Design a binder for this molecule. Structure first.
Ligand SMILES: [Mg+2]
Ligand SMILES: [Mg+2]
Ligand SMILES: [Mg+2]
Ligand SMILES: [Mg+2]
Ligand SMILES: [Mg+2]
Ligand SMILES: [Mg+2]
Ligand SMILES: [Mg+2]
Ligand SMILES: [Mg+2]
Ligand SMILES: [Mg+2]
Ligand SMILES: [Mg+2]
Ligand SMILES: [Mg+2]
Ligand SMILES: [Mg+2]
Lengths: 129, 186, 82, 13, 82, 149
RNA sequence: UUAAAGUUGCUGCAGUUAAAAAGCUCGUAGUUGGAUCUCUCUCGGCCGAAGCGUUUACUUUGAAAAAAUUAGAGUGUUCAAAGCAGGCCGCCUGGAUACCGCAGCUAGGAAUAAUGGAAUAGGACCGCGGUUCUAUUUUGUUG
């Protein structure tokens, strides 16, 4: 059945992107999906989005800028040490120059970059570029 | 006719309870108003200095206040002249249990008392003569939020002169930014 | 793009589609740079002014080059509301 | 116990 | 195609989407208010009604159930509610 | 999909957004509860009751009006099924399939559907055992099946 | 024997026709699992000892992790592989540092993921009553 809603969300937006669509309807939504999208949004890869609140689970409608090539998830969530991070990004990202690994950490959800700053490890969620 | 939990009355509470007394003597509602009480009251600034009255009632009496709410608002308004009077139930917010705690936690907190639930019962109450239709949380490119709230289109002419008063009210208790729209229809 | 010193090191700076924002390829010959003219609002004659669009070859096959041209025009007010 | 709480409920009610 | 307001659908269209796939899920049935002609009495009924319902005093049979909606007996007026 | 069938389909109810009891409804919480009580004393499951109210009495969801969900009302007032009414139904249906299955031995299909219905029984049961609605010695047994219903 | 081998594939391969998906369904263990919830009193000089908060996993931090080897400083073995030496006109110095899976300790963090807390209220929190028990002070000491 449906497990890992995050995965299904980002598949959907990545597809609506390759299709070159303007908006997306991604459902259901999560307090995780939301903070992920937000971290994505601060760097601009996406745009503003709006949460249709239904009495059950969310739907989220996302506005889109062509700036997103790939958006992905890594299942299972792996526990990523600080020391490991390098390896991870060097595997995942197109370049040292750009793109992000998003992890949840004790601090909050964030970018590999910002966590490097805060000196925290955590679990991997996904990545984008 | 006021019963604060902290047990100390105020100057707003004084005239407002007195207003209710006057509505017990001079109005058709006497029995109901005898039964009921209010816990608290406030005044605030919204929409270019326009003034709003906030009336906190004890929760189990709320659905009773809902009976007479419109009449009460007319009369209590003309007693207080131009102001906008809105009723909100007094709500317990039980702090989120953490790894660091004493035992203030013996039995678990019920969903009913909790941040999100309360903010939505507040929102529920504010608009009272209007139902709530649908609610849309929009996010700014900033990372800030705003909440569109949809109301019954039938009750429109009833509440549509208030509107931005709510927007101020909600902001002062809750702390979020809210707009109000009347949908065309379904 | 820019090195540390701030020079632009690049052969050329490619144009992105106006509709869908993809990069228009060095050799993509299905691409369009379309010129739409501006009238004088009093007369209805031609100014010498124009607003320009680009559309990559992807969107042309999908046929939705048309839709996008259109709502681009609306966003420029070259097409009336309704 | 059961009887005590039930009777406590009727006597509180 | 490539431009749609998912946020503001046309009400026409939303009457046409399936009851779970609307932007927010809306029941397709409504409570109706039935009056058999020879009686004064008002009854509240469900639009899609299983069982069979009755006006008490006249033993008037209000409706037969069917697959989708209950079909009321002839001459019997009804008013959808709000 | 369906758990035991190939078929995958959409048939359900969608509850309206508004949880507020509408205006027209003239019944109290308590009126409805008395209604419920006598309707259970005519020996009906939760399902029955709910639909009955929905049809004649204009109660969309008993839940909204009286604040509690149906089965809790009945179990608080003490009139409740011993075993949860669905598990009841499953067992009755399983019984029936056996009763026809003794006389027609040559039927393979019925024999197979029996196994399905049984497996469903056990999943359900073990659910009611982890959730303590059943004494955890409780066991579906083919022979005493006829009794429980 | 290692790479080449993305020809053992966790990263990372395949399974319509090239090698390959079970005749079909039920099914226990196994793996996997939807939304949802923003710390406090007894002692000591307002702060330490005393508590606990449901418990874990995850994470960061501390201390412990034999030397040799490996990574890595210093040093013209005449160079280097080495060695741990040397260097100044009796003095001046070296002989560092990192890494050390997992397990086990330590102190922060509370996002994620488990898990618990009240449903015939044998629930919390209040203070009032009885019944039984027994420790010890006190009636200048002993009973
Ligand atoms: Mg199955
Ligand atoms: Mg090899
Ligand atoms: Mg290799
Ligand atoms: Mg191969
Ligand atoms: Mg062949
Ligand atoms: Mg073959
Ligand atoms: Mg096959
Ligand atoms: Mg199993
Ligand atoms: Mg989950
Ligand atoms: Mg060593
Ligand atoms: Mg070495
Ligand atoms: Mg360790």
């Amino acid at each position: 059945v449906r497990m890992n809603v995050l995965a299904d969300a980002l598949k959907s937006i990545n597809n609506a992107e390759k299709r070159g669509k303007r908006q997306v309807l991604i459902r259901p939504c999560s307090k995780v999906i939301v903070r992920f999208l937000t971290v994505m949004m601060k760097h601009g890869y996406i745009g503003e989005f709006e949460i249709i609140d239904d009495h059950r689970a969310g739907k989220i409608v996302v506005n889109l800028t062509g700036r997103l090539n790939k958006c992905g998830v890594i299942s299972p969530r792996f526990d990523v040490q600080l020391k490991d991070l390098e390896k991870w990004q060097n595997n995942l990202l197109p370049s040292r120059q750009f793109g992000f690994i998003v992890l949840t950490t004790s601090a909050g959800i964030m970018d590999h970059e910002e966590a490097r700053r805060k000196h925290t490890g955590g679990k991997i969620l996904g990545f984008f570029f | 006719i006021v019963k604060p939990n902290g047990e100390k009355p105020d100057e707003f509470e004084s005239g407002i309870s007195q207003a209710l007394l006057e509505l017990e003597m001079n109005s058709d509602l006497k029995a109901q108003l005898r039964e009921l009480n209010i816990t608290a009251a406030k005044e605030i600034e919204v929409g270019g200095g326009r003034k709003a009255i906030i009336i906190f009632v004890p929760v189990p009496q709320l659905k009773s206040f809902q009976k007479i709410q419109v009449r009460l608002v007319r009369e209590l308004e003309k007693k207080f002249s131009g102001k906008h009077v809105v009723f909100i139930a007094q709500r317990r917010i039980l702090p989120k249990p953490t790894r660091k705690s004493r035992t203030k936690n013996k039995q678990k907190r019920p969903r009913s008392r909790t941040l999100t639930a309360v903010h939505d019962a507040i929102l529920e109450d504010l608009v009272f003569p209007s139902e709530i239709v649908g609610k849309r949380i929009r996010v700014k490119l900033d990372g800030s939020r705003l909440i569109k709230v949809h109301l019954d289109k039938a009750q429109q002419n009833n509440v549509e002169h208030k509107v931005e008063t709510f927007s101020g009210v909600y902001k002062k208790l809750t702390g979020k930014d809210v707009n109000f729209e009347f949908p065309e229809f379904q | 793009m820019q090195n540390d010193a701030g020079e632009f090191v690049d052969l050329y700076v490619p144009r992105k589609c106006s509709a869908s924002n993809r990069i228009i390829g060095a050799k993509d010959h299905a691409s369009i740079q379309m010129n739409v003219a501006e009238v004088d609002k009093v007369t209805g004659r031609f100014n010498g002014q124009f607003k320009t669009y680009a559309i990559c070859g992807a969107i042309r096959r999908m046929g939705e080059s048309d839709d996008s041209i259109l709502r681009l025009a609306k966003a420029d007010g070259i097409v009336s509301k309704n | 116990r059961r009887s005590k709480t039930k009777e406590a409920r009727k006597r509180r009610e | 195609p490539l431009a749609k307001d998912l946020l503001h659908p046309s009400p026409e269209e939303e009457k046409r989407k399936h009851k779970k796939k609307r932007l927010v899920q809306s029941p397709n049935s409504y409570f109706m208010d039935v009056k058999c002609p020879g009686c004064y009495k008002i009854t509240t009924v469900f639009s899609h009604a299983q069982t069979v319902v009755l006006c008490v005093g006249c033993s008037t049979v209000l409706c037969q159930p069917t697959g989708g909606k209950a079909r009321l007996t002839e001459g019997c007026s009804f008013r959808r509610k709000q | 999909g369906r758990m035991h069938a190939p078929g995958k389909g959409l048939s359900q109810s969608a509850l309206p957004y508004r949880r507020s009891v509408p205006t027209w409804l003239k019944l109290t919480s308590d009126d409805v509860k008395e209604q419920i009580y006598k309707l259970a004393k005519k020996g009906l499951t939760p399902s029955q009751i709910g639909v009955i109210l929905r049809d004649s009495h204009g109660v969309a969801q008993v839940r909204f009006v009286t604040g509690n969900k149906i089965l809790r009302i009945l179990k608080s007032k003490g009139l409740a099924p011993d075993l949860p009414e669905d598990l009841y139904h499953l067992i009755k249906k399983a019984v029936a399939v056996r009763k026809h299955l003794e006389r027609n031995r040559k039927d393979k299909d019925a024999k197979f559907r029996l196994i399905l219905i049984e497996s469903r029984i056990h999943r359900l049961a073990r659910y009611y055992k982890t959730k303590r609605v059943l004494p955890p010695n409780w066991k579906y047994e083919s022979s005493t099946a006829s009794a429980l219903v």
